[PDB]
Write a protein that binds this ligand. Structure first.
Ligand SMILES: COc1ccc([C@H]2CC(=O)c3c(O)cc(O[C@H]4O[C@@H](CO)[C@@H](O)[C@@H](O)[C@H]4O[C@H]4O[C@@H](C)[C@H](O)[C@@H](O)[C@H]4O)cc3O2)cc1O
Ligand SMILES: [Cl-]
Ligand SMILES: [Cl-]
Ligand SMILES: [Cl-]
Ligand SMILES: [Cl-]
Ligand SMILES: [Cl-]
Ligand SMILES: [Cl-]
Ligand SMILES: [Cl-]
Ligand SMILES: [Cl-]
Ligand SMILES: [Cl-]
Ligand SMILES: [Cl-]
Ligand SMILES: [Cl-]
Ligand SMILES: [Cl-]
Ligand SMILES: [Cl-]
Lengths: 114, 114, 114
């Protein structure tokens, strides 16, 4: 799976260890081995949410399965909780888009997961 | 909804008020309150369109509904017009990908919209 | 079509000619004219793959058609090969998400391709 967070919070406000915390928390939440979790954090972005440039985040989670109504509610509480605690972003200033990928549409290691 | 524009135009060429203009114009275009609109502009990118690194843009619009044939043509005219007027990017050097998100796949405020 | 590569490799390690090579190889691979191929490379990113910050890449290819099981295996071999040769990223530290876009959902030049 792949998790991306884009935020206007400055880089120095991203704690050391945040990428590893995302990796391990998402490995547990998706049930997949951590070796398959990729995480990407993009701070210092020029962004606005509802017109305001207070701290906000736009995120995505792509996974081959493990995506659905109840699962995404659970991921949203987990991820909003992490963004609030670690980056000080209010949960009502976060959007997370969830993508259930077909294995044939995810390339890796010269091939795909199909 | 969420609108992202990635461009090779330099940061200093992005006018004051650009995020705000996008927020209110996308609010009008989607018919949604400005408080729902998130916008993200990424200047100074290493990008090419047709092999040329003249000014160009790669963009996305994600919305729960309000995405379709005629609607997307109207969004493209609006957004290309803004990129041309404000960033001086030719419309034939802009791509915008449109995504009609299911409410269950959009997380916000510790939950989703399902 | 559009191809985006996000990587933690530093900008100085992206060789001259890289965007052009991507443009030309993707035109050839997809069968589409090079004038319509857009490419975007994002170095210096804060990213991990499997929990490690060794060089890695997260990429996407969006195309109106020319996406499918065998085609995507072929694109992955091509694109991982380029990333290994030019950016010195191991193919097993690359993900590429593939998107078969409907023409109505790709904006360009004040309209869409529908
Ligand atoms: C086609 O179907 C749908 C299409 C679109 C949507 C979306 C899009 C989204 O972006 C969105 C949003 O951003 C905020 C939003 O807010 C309100 O939803 C009501 C109930 O709807 C209340 O419960 C309020 O509490 C109210 O919640 C808040 O108002 C916010 C602006 C504040 O930040 C927050 O603190 C609280 O004051 C509702 C939203 O709806 C949902 C759908 O089902
Ligand atoms: Cl996955
Ligand atoms: Cl970190
Ligand atoms: Cl942890
Ligand atoms: Cl599953
Ligand atoms: Cl579920
Ligand atoms: Cl898919
Ligand atoms: Cl996109
Ligand atoms: Cl919406
Ligand atoms: Cl969706
Ligand atoms: Cl295409
Ligand atoms: Cl992607
Ligand atoms: Cl195929
Ligand atoms: Cl589509």
């Amino acid at each position: 799976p792949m998790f991306i967070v884009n935020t206007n919070v400055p880089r120095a406000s991203v704690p050391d260890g945040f990428l590893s915390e995302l990796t391990q928390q998402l490995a547990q939440a998706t049930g997949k081995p951590p070796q398959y979790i990729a995480v990407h954090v993009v701070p210092d972005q020029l962004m606005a949410f509802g017109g305001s440039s207070e701290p906000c985040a736009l995120c995505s989670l792509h996974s081959i399965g493990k995506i659905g109504g109840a699962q995404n509610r659970s991921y949203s509480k987990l991820l909003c909780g992490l963004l609030a605690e670690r980056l000080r972003i209010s949960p009502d200033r976060v959007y997370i888009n969830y993508y259930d990928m077909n294995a044939a549409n995810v390339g890796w290691n010269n091939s795909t997961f199909a």
